[PDB]
Amino acid sequence: GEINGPESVLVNTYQWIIRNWETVKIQWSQNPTMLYNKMEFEPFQSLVPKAIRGQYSGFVRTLFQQMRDVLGTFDTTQIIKLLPFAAAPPKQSRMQFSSLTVNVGMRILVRGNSPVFNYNKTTKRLTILGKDAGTLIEDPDESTSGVESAVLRG
């Protein structure tokens, strides 16, 4: 874990999700509301501007509900990315956010990578604010995790 201030809170939150993913995925499937309410996410929530925390949470919880209803747990990187923004008490709105800001305002883009959140499909590792957060499991049938074939030449 990192210790530098707000940046560390962000890095460590995603590290925690990755380290606990095999539990988190099951809670997200079976009892997501409970998952969203874990005190684990309180520090992250404090990085989200107070005036918009609730709106972001309404957006992400709704998106997750719609996601889960039609797709289930397919999208690991996206579930991990958005999960901490579900932590605040939700305030529902009709606003569709393309990005979500944290105070470190830096933007996490909803689709795809950003300076803040950068998943690489070749190494299968997540990078947050230029720091390693760990290895993601996109395919739950995979035995070997991490870097793809044909990366190291020899």
Residue numbers in the entry: 537 to 640, 644 to 693
Passage from the reporting paper:
Each segment is packaged in a ribonucleoprotein complex (RNP) together with the nucleoprotein (NP) and the three subunits (PA, PB1 and PB2) of the trimeric RNA-dependent RNA polymerase, which mediates viral transcription and replication in the host cell nucleus. The PB2 residue at position 627, which in nearly all human and avian influenza strains is either a lysine or glutamate respectively, is the best characterised polymerase determinant of host range and virulence. Here we extend the structure-based exploration of host determinant residues through the identification by random construct screening of a new PB2 domain (residues 538–693) that contains position 627 and is thus denoted the 627-domain. The 156 amino acid 627-domain is located between the cap-binding and NLS-domains and contains six of the seventeen host species determining sites described within the PB2 subunit: N567D/E, I588A/V, T613V/A, K627E, T661A, T674A/S where for each position the consensus human and then avian residues are given.
PB2 residues 538–676 form a compact, highly ordered domain with a novel fold as indicated by the lack of structural homologues found by DALI. The N-terminal half (residues 538–623) comprises a 6 helical cluster with a hydrophobic core rich in aromatic residues. The C-terminal half of the 627-domain (residues 635–676) comprises five short beta-strands which wrap around one side of the helical bundle. Linking the alpha- and beta- halves of the domain is an extended peptide which wraps around helix α5 and contains the host-specific residue 627. The side-chain of Lys627 is fully solvent exposed and indeed electron density beyond Cγ is lacking. In the crystal, the C-terminal extension of the domain (residues 676–693) exhibits an extended conformation which is determined by the crystal packing. The Lys627 side-chain is solvent exposed and forms part of a striking, positively-charged surface patch which also includes residues Lys586, Arg589, Arg597 and Arg630. The domain fold is unlike any other known protein so the structure in itself does not shed light on the functional role of residue 627, although its exposed surface location suggests it might mediate an interaction with another viral or host protein. The high resolution crystal structure of this domain from a human influenza A strain and of the K627E variant, shows that it has a novel fold with Lys/Glu627 exposed to the solvent.
